[PDB]
Amino acid sequence: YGTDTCPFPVLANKTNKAKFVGCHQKCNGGDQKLTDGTACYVVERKVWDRMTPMLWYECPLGECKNGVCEDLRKKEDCRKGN
Amino acid sequence: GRECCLEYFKGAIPLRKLKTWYQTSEDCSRDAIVFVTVQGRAICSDPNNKRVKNAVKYLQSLE
């Protein structure tokens, strides 16, 4: 099915802008990397899995570089959708 | 919703392998239909492709 066709977890913020959770994931047994410059949150997928929908969490802002969400040293409110 | 699609599967999914579907949020960088197969695989799909739109209508008619 390709290794870039899997849905990718996101979190919303208080302006409703979606940002991706990390910059890499496994996809149909291959590696999926987001494009450099993509806005992301420095949050592990397995932590996102535990996030309760629509409760506010605190997310470190980042940008993707070679498949890693590189920290921008800023935090903002983030929430998981339904 | 809680996931967004980056690229679409280029190819046909047989109708009999489709279990359900949903549309990603308009807050995503792209629009997409996600199909969930009977094996639990989630497949980002082109929401402007006629075959995809038809498969959504197929799944809706079974509901």
Side-chain angles (χ1 to χ4, degrees), chain A residues 1-13 18-25 27-32 34-45 47-57 59-64 66-72 76-82, chain B residues 1-9 11-15 18-22 24-25 28-49 52-56 58-62:
Chain A
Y1 288 134
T3 57
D4 50 6
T5 64
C6 303
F8 206 110
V10 300
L11 292 165
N13 76 311
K19 292 179 176 174
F20 292 96
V21 175
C23 303
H24 60 82
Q25 74 172 357
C27 176
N28 306 319
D31 301 332
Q32 178 174 15
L34 300 182
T35 56
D36 283 348
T38 304
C40 55
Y41 288 130
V42 192
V43 173
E44 275 310 316
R45 165 63 185 258
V47 173
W48 182 88
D49 286 335
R50 309 275 59 85
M51 271 183 197
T52 307
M54 305 283 306
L55 295 188
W56 283 116
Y57 293 93
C59 275
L61 277 77
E63 276 179 359
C64 297
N66 197 15
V68 182
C69 193
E70 287 298 348
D71 206 313
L72 285 171
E76 79 193 8
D77 299 340
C78 55
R79 82 216 289 192
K80 188 181 198 182
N82 278 309
Chain B
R2 67 184 68 188
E3 305 161 315
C4 294
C5 287
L6 281 299
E7 290 302 334
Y8 308 131
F9 171 48
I13 311 176
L15 290 188
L18 298 176
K19 177 159 72 154
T20 197
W21 67 280
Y22 63 95
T24 57
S25 168
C28 295
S29 59
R30 314 189 64 161
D31 283 317
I33 300 292
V34 177
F35 286 123
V36 185
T37 74
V38 299
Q39 304 293 73
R41 297 192 178 96
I43 297 170
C44 291
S45 305
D46 190 342
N48 300 299
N49 181 270
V52 169
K53 288 184 282 185
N54 280 357
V56 168
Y58 178 67
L59 292 173
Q60 286 174 302
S61 69
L62 310 186

